[PDB]
Design a protein around this ligand. Structure first.
Ligand SMILES: *[C@@H]1O[C@H](CO[C@@H]2O[C@@H](C)[C@@H](O)[C@@H](O)[C@@H]2O)[C@@H](O[C@@H]2O[C@H](CO)[C@@H](O[C@@H]3O[C@H](CO[C@H]4O[C@H](CO)[C@@H](O)[C@H](O)[C@@H]4O[C@@H]4O[C@H](CO)[C@@H](O)[C@H](O)[C@H]4NC(C)=O)[C@@H](O)[C@H](O[C@H]4O[C@H](CO)[C@@H](O)[C@H](O)[C@@H]4O[C@@H]4O[C@H](CO)[C@@H](O)[C@H](O)[C@H]4NC(C)=O)[C@@H]3O)[C@H](O)[C@H]2NC(C)=O)[C@H](O)[C@H]1NC(C)=O
Ligand SMILES: *[C@@H]1O[C@H](CO[C@@H]2O[C@@H](C)[C@@H](O)[C@@H](O)[C@@H]2O)[C@@H](O[C@@H]2O[C@H](CO)[C@@H](O[C@@H]3O[C@H](CO)[C@@H](O)[C@H](O[C@H]4O[C@H](CO)[C@@H](O)[C@H](O)[C@@H]4O)[C@@H]3O)[C@H](O)[C@H]2NC(C)=O)[C@H](O)[C@H]1NC(C)=O
Ligand SMILES: *[C@@H]1O[C@H](CO[C@@H]2O[C@@H](C)[C@@H](O)[C@@H](O)[C@@H]2O)[C@@H](O[C@@H]2O[C@H](CO)[C@@H](O[C@@H]3O[C@H](CO)[C@@H](O)[C@H](O)[C@@H]3O)[C@H](O)[C@H]2NC(C)=O)[C@H](O)[C@H]1NC(C)=O
Ligand SMILES: *[C@@H]1O[C@H](CO[C@@H]2O[C@@H](C)[C@@H](O)[C@@H](O)[C@@H]2O)[C@@H](O[C@@H]2O[C@H](CO)[C@@H](O)[C@H](O)[C@H]2NC(C)=O)[C@H](O)[C@H]1NC(C)=O
Ligand SMILES: *[C@@H]1O[C@H](CO)[C@@H](O)[C@H](O)[C@H]1NC(C)=O
Lengths: 309, 201
């Protein structure tokens, strides 16, 4: 007698699946009136045979298959790897042959890469530098730069902002204030997000700021000459006099150099008691690995008293 | 522990329309793995082991028990079937071997009119050409209607067959009414071609 065979068709296209790395994924393929025909799963890009009916041809022990009423055919991949992402094909041995496809995506939380990511930068003021931060993850992570302690960042237009996106933080014409700790942030919607601490150290030659370039004092009393230096790396601060003779530590002279954060020094020279020999022009000097600078202070005498005649 | 191919299977295979094509794939130390044939063009499976999956009856897997050879047999090849067929092993990752089948149409022809009329007493000269085949034919049949012709079956028959020129000249002297019929030239590596003969008197 025998009977007529019906034309097997796909009930619906393969539904896309996104799966977390290291977990399991399930590619399903629904057919109608399969009857005597057979369903097959294949990896498209590799063109590798995976399953036929209820048999796993591939030796990949992470691959499995199972069907429901010969309608829903589901392939299971254990311990998902990023390699496993790609297109898969559901094929029926009809005549002609029918096939569907569906994409499996693997999501990975972001991870910052040591080699391609900047370590601890040391650049001279005036040159340019780019802080770099590279991460891996699925999808492609976004890179956000932030300055530690809420300090803003300035774009090329002069606008100040709190964050900058992009793997490269281009700083044309670095400056003193750009020195500090920077935060790189990589996020892709797959927790957890990650961040890396990148320090930027800026070298510059010392810069002296004389509190008062003119100072009058009376004989026999005391006077204090004041300067403030700003230099990184740290500088040595000393006082000279006239042609450059270093000031003698003994006798009337006394000094006090104290650091006050921000890589600034407060250098003070106290002369006491003033006599004619101690009046004249002085110099406060500071030097580091890049050079030295000075500021001149003129100390003149003013009489105790004045009479209008 | 690890399977590998034979290296001597002749990747390039050329078949002619009709007859049948064979792609031989040999694997050393197979083990529990399975050998499969696929069509790279549309990623259609053909054979797995000895079983056929394609449901195109022309494809069949040939494997003698215990042998190293897994032969993909294509019955009634056609020009569309020209493409790349891959021999595949179930390992992970899979090891493949890309065969390239190229089928060509090879037709034979007999110089002269398709239908000849010669007066009784005159001679018959049927020159057959099989220039399309890639390899020169190893034999050329001459069918008198349906039965094979033999130079000894009748006096005055001269048959010169040259595989060097892919030709075969059949000469029948002093035709007779009995000599009428469609004479067929069927070379080995090529298609058929016939010529019907009629006599007078
Ligand atoms: C060489 O020179 C240096 C530099 O001199 C200084 O700088 C130059 C440029 C000139 O301006 C000078 O005029 C100037 O003096 C000398 O170093 C200085 O020495 C003086 C003492 O001689 C110190 O004064 C003390 O300061 C502390 C407070 O210190 C904080 O605040 C300062 C600014 O206000 C800041 O500069 C300090 O770095 C520090 O900063 C704080 O840091 C903490 C931690 O990070 C942070 O949380 C704060 O936010 C931060 N603050 C700021 C504003 O940034 C002050 O407390 C001292 O007062 C106590 O002592 C006095 C008597 O000595 C007394 O009158 C006060 O009432 C107070 O008394 C104390 O009270 C508490 C509360 O009850 C009690 O528990 C204690 O027991 C009690 N102690 C006593 C003894 O009574 C004092 O005023 C300068 O800080 C110091 N500066 C630097 C930069 O080092 C140096 O001495 C010179 N050496 C020689 C040999 O000449
Ligand atoms: C199933 O998933 C696959 C793979 O996508 C990946 O998985 C998804 C689950 C999801 O996570 C995706 O984010 C992830 O990437 C999808 O296949 C992709 O389909 C898109 C759209 O068709 C393709 O993008 C196209 O690429 C062309 C170049 O090859 C480009 O020309 C196209 O641009 C044209 O069309 C766009 C509108 O989409 C228009 O804006 C343009 O201007 C231009 O006209 C377009 O960008 C991807 O390449 C495909 N990925 C792969 C690997 O092939 C699939 O679509 C999805 N199916 C369903 C039903 O969701
Ligand atoms: C004289 O005879 C030739 C063929 O000679 C022989 O005829 C067969 C009956 C057998 O005896 C064979 O040994 C040999 O071929 C005739 O040419 C051939 O005729 C046959 C039948 O007429 C054709 O067969 C067809 O082939 C097509 C191919 O697709 C099939 O689809 C058909 O179902 C059918 O089988 C054959 O193609 C043809 N050969 C050609 C055209 O090269 C010849 O026609 C005959 N003389 C006359 C006047 O008819
Ligand atoms: C039998 O005939 C063949 C070819 O048939 C003829 O070929 C032409 C010369 C022309 O006469 C056509 O109308 C016929 O169909 C002969 O073979 C050819 O012979 C010629 C002349 O000798 C020669 O130039 C060609 O190279 C030959 N071709 C081949 C393929 O060999 C053949 O000589 C004839 N034999 C006899 C005994 O008559
Ligand atoms: C920095 O600017 C100088 C001067 O224009 C230029 O030579 C150099 O290529 C720049 N470098 C970067 C990284 O922008």
């Amino acid at each position: 007698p025998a009977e007529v065979i019906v034309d097997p068709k796909f009930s619906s296209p393969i539904v896309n699946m996104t799966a977390p790395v290291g977990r399991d994924a399930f590619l399903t393929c629904v057919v109608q009136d399969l009857g005597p025909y057979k369903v097959a799963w294949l990896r498209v890009d590799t063109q590798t045979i995976l399953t036929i009916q209820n048999h796993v041809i591939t030796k990949n022990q992470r691959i499995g298959i199972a069907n429901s009423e010969h309608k829903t055919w589901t392939m299971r991949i254990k311990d998902i790897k990023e390699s496993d992402k790609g297109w898969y094909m559901c094929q029926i041995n009809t005549d002609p042959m029918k096939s569907q496809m569906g994409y499996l995506d693997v999501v990975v939380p972001p991870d910052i890469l040591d080699y391609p990511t900047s370590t601890d930068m040391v650049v001279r003021e005036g040159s340019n530098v780019t802080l770099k931060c590279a991460a891996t993850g699925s999808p492609e992570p976004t890179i956000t730069w932030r300055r530690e302690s809420g300090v803003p960042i300035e774009l090329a237009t002069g606008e100040e902002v709190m964050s900058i996106e992009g793997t490269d933080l281009v700083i044309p014409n670095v400056r003193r204030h750009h020195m500090g700790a920077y935060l790189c942030i990589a996020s892709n919607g797959v927790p957890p997000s990650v961040s890396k601490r990148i320090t930027l150290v800026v070298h510059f030659p010392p810069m002296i700021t004389v509190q008062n370039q003119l100072i009058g004092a009376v004989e026999g009393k005391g006077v204090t000459l004041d300067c403030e230096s700003e230099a990184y790396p740290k500088s040595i601060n000393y006082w000279t006099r006239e042609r450059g003779e270093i000031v003698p530590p003994g006798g009337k002279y006394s000094a006090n150099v104290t650091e006050i954060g921000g890589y600034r020094n407060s250098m003070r020279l106290h002369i006491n008691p003033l006599t004619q020999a101690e009046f004249g022009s002085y110099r406060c000097v500071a030097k580091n690995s890049l050079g030295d600078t000075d500021g001149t202070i003129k100390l003149y005498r003013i009489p105790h008293h004045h009479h209008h005649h | 522990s690890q399977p590998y191919f034979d290296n001597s299977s002749r990747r390039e295979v050329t078949a002619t329309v009709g007859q049948a094509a064979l792609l031989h794939c040999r694997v050393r130390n197979l083990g529990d793995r399975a050998v499969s044939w696929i069509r790279k063009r549309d990623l259609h499976i053909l054979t797995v082991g000895i079983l056929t999956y394609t449901n195109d009856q022309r494809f069949q897997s040939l494997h003698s028990e215990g042998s190293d050879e897994w032969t993909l047999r294509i019955s009634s090849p056609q020009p569309r079937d020209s493409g790349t067929y891959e021999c595949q092993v179930s390992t992970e990752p899979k090891i493949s071997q890309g065969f390239r089948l190229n089928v060509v149409v090879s037709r034979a022809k007999i110089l002269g009119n398709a239908e000849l009329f010669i007066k009784s007493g005159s001679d018959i000269n049927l020159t057959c050409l099989a220039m399309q085949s890639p390899v020169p034919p190893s034999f050329i049949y001459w069918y008198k209607g349906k039965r094979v012709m033999n130079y000894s079956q009748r006096g005055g028959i001269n048959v010169i067959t040259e595989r060097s020129t892919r030709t075969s000249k059949l000469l029948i002297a002093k035709a007779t009414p009995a000599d009428s019929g469609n004479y067929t030239c069927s070379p080995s590596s090529s298609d058929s071609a016939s010529v019907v003969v009629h006599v007078i008197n």
